[model samples]
Target: MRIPLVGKDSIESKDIGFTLIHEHLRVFSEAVRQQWPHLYNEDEEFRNAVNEVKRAMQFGVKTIVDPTVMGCGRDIRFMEKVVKATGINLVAGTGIFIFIDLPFYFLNRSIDEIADLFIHDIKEGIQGTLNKAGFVKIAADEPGITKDVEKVIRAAAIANKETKVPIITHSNAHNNTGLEQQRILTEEGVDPGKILIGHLGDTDNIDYIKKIADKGSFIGLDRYGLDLFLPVDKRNETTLRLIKDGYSDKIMISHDYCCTIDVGTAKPEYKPKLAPRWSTTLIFEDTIPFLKRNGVNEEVIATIFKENPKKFFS
Candidate 1:
């Protein structure tokens, strides 16, 4: 009945309206923040994030589920600052985001030890903020499940088994690595229903998308405007097809748009122009109308935005 959140500890299921399951306030370089703090403009980044959340509010979005974690520069203090500034419910996650080798600090830890950290963040708090994580994040990328990647996956699976929170993943759908991820997590006795298979929109293969959805996990058609991976038309066709095939509740649509950034030496403003249509609020602003024009009913659309996430966190 409750979804773990960053600002207020938790929010009741019915109150989380129009949730975006796989969004990010940032994916920056923490190294920059610690070493060269001036290079990373907190003022501009924080203002941009607050503006974007307020923009999403105009589209009736009540919550933004941010899966930004360890490797991706998850700034918990900054996140809570924005949550306070805009008063929007922003849920955060806990986990490392690397795809290949485990970090030097984590390489020697046992799976149970890693699971301990994740569970602590879920049940206790993250970064001494006393705001619990709603879920754990795990990833398997184009390299597939390397030895270290599988370690993180198993650790996340163990954590979810203990906390009963969902596992949101950054998957390489083009490589069908989500299947490999599901195989390992379910083998760890984690429920398939609690997993949200991300980046499925990167591939137009319905058979691939259904292969995971049929297992009862939520499918994240989460990258909406990155046409370099898949065209807008194909993304639309895949989503429309999935809904028409009666998998509406099992799927979640999102943009995976990182509204703020300070990655390496790249200018953060350059990212938005790279994908002109990308925004945290684009899905609700445009996709809903596109769906209705293509014969998707309000009931099914509601299942995607509102009912699906309500069920997801419960």
Candidate 2:
């Protein structure tokens, strides 16, 4: 069960009640931050995040893997305090996030140097990187391996080598991102299994998920209940088909929850109201019902909730 340097002590399966393998607390999609500066004020924001996490746990969500990378405006200190208050394992991440916020230096630095930054962050703790990152994130903007994508591959490879931290990636929906990422990571001398391809379930292509799974890497059905882009039933149907095909062990699931962040669009003068839509209402109100209707029973739910996460975190 040893997963190089990243594996920690094994946690109780029962204790893993309602695990969210991917989610975010203070995720800003750029638009909200530019116009709604008031939301950035620490007091109001922290209170809202804490309330959300607390509410999620009240319905049995014991752990949440917050993929709050360095550039994604992920406030690790804020998350740490919330974890302390809520007693949830808020697993955060290290690497750069979305193509939009990539540091200018990434264009200049060698992969080794960037990996060194990742190594330092993991080994010394992310105390210096403006925030702590518990995982490493890489991304391909348009799915296929463009020049920028190749650079990230090298950085992630060296970083994984130096740190043994698990890697998660942004795969453009409905494209070759999953395969391209797997190839790039593997060719860079990193094990494919340690990688989690985000947004895999957001597409109609079961073969995409199957292809990555065939490579022995993990796929995240990471977006739950957010169907404005694609129907929730589509997500559910694909997941059910994947599970029925006997690939359950290769999949991880979550809502990719965002709290009041604009849905990646124009900046409004006001951040979306946190009063209703941003509530931690999904845990009970949406996810559970979705599972039941999808024929996902408690045992299947337990596997995704407990075993699957432990497999990755190991």
Candidate 3:
């Protein structure tokens, strides 16, 4: 299978090396960035993202599945810049990241109409550029499934059916909204196998994640190094247990690191001391070695970093 990348030729599915299924190059509040332009230096942030991705390359990361869109501040041109600079396989996404309430533009639109926008990105290009999206992204966070949120979920499923691209979701694992996401997508006629339940690592509840995995959806233990949400120890332990129980192929690991985020609110002192290990390299430099130290087989580790993403993307 050939996987499409932003600003580059499609690479074979097996060639997506040490893939991180969820990460962000830039995620500033666009509304604020425009109103207060001095809050962010667009050129500098672009350079920083390019450098960060280049650093990731040193650790052998070749592909990044970036679900940055709508509410998360999607910037296709910036993505193109990073890919051009670093030669990383960036599989971009279509759809929104709204937690609740549809924006006014979508409030009056029907599900199929909204789905057309996502389908356009898959078949055509994102933001009028030739770079195409490879997956569907939707979000249902702590607010659970609002009426508007349900519409987005249904629309994403429709787009997935149209494009044969898988759906990647932003679900609050603590609120058990991941289950609701799965149910909604399933009800919309999507195969459970084509969905990835994101942010499952924010909790250590093995049974909670196993429930989703057992339903045939991918396990998105996609957040790593954020000790503020849950300790890395608990996250690693839960991951180890999941692999031990033989869900390696269903699990996808990533740091979800953003090179620049919430720029208007960023303070010199605002850097998170709670998540000191937060970065794209944490898993490569730390988590994998720890897992290996505790008896995680190299083959299973390979399945997590490389095989699982190929299956999900393909």
Candidate 4:
């Protein structure tokens, strides 16, 4: 059996196929969604989560890394049902999410303190209160890292030191946030190759992805099909160009779908469409063929779909 990266149980490398590196299962419509008082009214969450998993499994999604962190109301107990019902390898995380005002509970804490919390969650579980999170997630804005983001990076580094779980970052679109994230992580001693800096399709800076690839880090052009800012064809073209330009091994792809929130809710430039929420099936169907038509070979597809991720996390 292949050793499971990020604490997942041992399974053959062959059993791991067509994995979605980062996604959310069921998102909370409100801030209090993780708390007990609010959860009592969310009886429907269980069934919805299970059904979504079934839908994904029917479409041949074998594994999904749900980086639904602390604020997104990551319901692990409900996710247990998703694992049982759909038999898809569902992995989750323990960390904070994007918010308007940063939570003060984290402000007074030193980076070491924050990293300790992340280590606890990764090693023993959430603050030693819940089951172990398979990985750690850290998010930052486009222009630069905030004070809060520093804590998250430090926490993720600490967690990586304690447990070799890979990291998935929440990064801004059309900016160097993803590359900046990988730099911060590497500075903190986590291997660049073990990190995935997500949402690169939102950025126009292909060089930004190349820089991360230069460091052997993963770059996720995860939201390619949305076609909000860039056309889908051009996005595929850019991705292929980057791969041919020597960034192939470090590149990965996804739809960033089944999410219920706006892209940049707190910022003025945020926009939402009814399109992405319904396009879970469009990713593997439409985008892969587009790449093939654009001269991406079967071996390249196998690299992005199979060999690359197995190496990144393994």
Candidate 5:
């Protein structure tokens, strides 16, 4: 099967080796940037992002799925540049991501309208480019699936129904939001295998994770290096436990690290001092060795880092 890549191209799913299911190239809204021009430094951000991708390439990461959807400030124009600079296969996503008030444009729209927009992005292209989105991303965080969140989730499900593109969610695992997401998506007639409940690594609750995987859905042990959510050691330990219990095939790993996030002051030293291991290469530079040391064999690693993604998209 062929996987859609950014810039209107497709690659064989089998060639999507050592893929990262969750990550970000940039996270800054165009509307916000228009009002605050200083929030973005395109040149600096581009250089940093290129360096990050190149570094990860040396460690065997061949593909990265950037889930910076609508609310997350997805600029496909810049994304195309990153692809050309690094030659790393970058897949883009399209969906709404919000936990509180819905964006003004979506407030008065019907679920069908939202789904139509997402379907257009997937089947047509994003931002008028021929680069079709490879997947859909929606969010349900601490608000516990508010009305607005439910709308987005249902819209995502409807879009998935038409496209059969896999859906990845930003779930508040601590509040069992992943389960709620599954309930909504499956209720809308989506197959469990077509969904990935992301950020399960933010919580150490294996029971919750197992419950998610037990339903035949993939669980994202993504967010590996974000110590602010869950420490690296705990994340590593929990992932290893899941693999030993034979959940590796249903699990995917990533750091969710972004090259540039315009929310806070875009500082150079911010990431290193805050989340030292928070980079595209975190799983390779740290988690892989840790997993190997703890007896997570090559077969399982291949399943998590390679085969699972191909299977999910297929």
Candidate 6:
């Protein structure tokens, strides 16, 4: 299977080793960046980002699926440099990521028009490079599925139908909006198996998680490090519980960590102090050891860390 990258090339699926299905290289509100250019430093950002990826590599992470798309500043040209610098496979994403307000460009557009942009990113290319996106990333949060949000969701489903690219979503586990996402995508003729309900690990409601997995969708226990949502230990327990209950094949893990993100008017370098375990390597560095000590076998861990993520792209 061919997986697209930001570097104007595709790689064999087998070459993808321990893959982090969801992560970000750089992210900021595009509007915020445009309005205040001083808030972002390209030189410093690239330096820090390249270093972060290289560090994650030391922990045995082979690839990262970066879902930083439209609303979030997605710089494919910059990403190409980072991928080359770190020698880590970086998969690019298409589609928008807005919870409530649709961008002006998409406000009055029909679903077909929106789908065309997404298809172009997958089939044509992103950021004017020959490299195409490997998957479509969309979002639905506490705002629920508003009209514009529903439009993007339907458009993403149409794009998936046309390109057969997988769909990864920013779902609100608190609001149980993943269920709503499934209903919309299913109604649009997209298979539930082709979608990943992301951020499910944010909530400890195992029954909610199982309900999504029961529909043949992949459960993204992704976001392992953000303790502000759920502590890493609790996330580990919830994930291990799912594995023990025979859902290993349906599970995928990631940190949802970003190399550089402008939280406010400045890029805080002290973020690690705030969320010490929020680094990208936390999965291999901490979660793996925790799982082993708690009696999860290597084979099952491999399913979440390796096999299942590779299968998601296929």
User: If scored against the real structure, what TM-score would every candidate get?
Assistant: 0.95, 0.82, 0.96, 0.84, 0.96, 0.96
Which runs in model 1 stand beyond 4 Å of their true positions? 264-273
Candidate 1 vs 6: which has more TM-score: 6
Error of 1 at 276 (Å): 1.2
Q: Supply the global lDDT for candidate 5.
A: 0.87
Q: Write the per-residue lDDT of candidate 5 for residues 59-86, one digit (tens) a residue.
A: 8888999999987788889999999988
- Give the clashing pairs for model 4: 121-125, 174-202, 174-203
Residue 80 CA error for candidate 5 (Å)? 0.6
lDDT for each candidate structure: 0.84, 0.68, 0.86, 0.69, 0.87, 0.86
Ranking by lDDT: 5, 6, 3, 1, 4, 2
Better of 3 and 6 by lDDT: 6
Residues 74-179, candidate 2: write the lDDT tens digits: 6656676776666665666777665543456566667677778777776665655333345688776563666666776678788887667678888777767667
Candidate 4 on 125-231: residue-level lDDT in tens? 55334456766877876546766767677778888887888888878765566767787888989888788887776666677667777887788878755666455
140-219 per-residue lDDT for model 6 (tens digits): 99999888888889999999888888999999898978989988898889988889999999999999999999988999
CA lDDT for candidate 2: 0.68
N/CA/C clash count, model 3: 0
Tens digits of per-residue lDDT, candidate 3, 112-186, equal: 999999999999989998888888888888788889898989999889888889999998888989999998899
* Structure candidate 2, residue pairs in collision: 92-134, 93-133, 93-134, 93-135, 94-135
Clashes of 6: 0
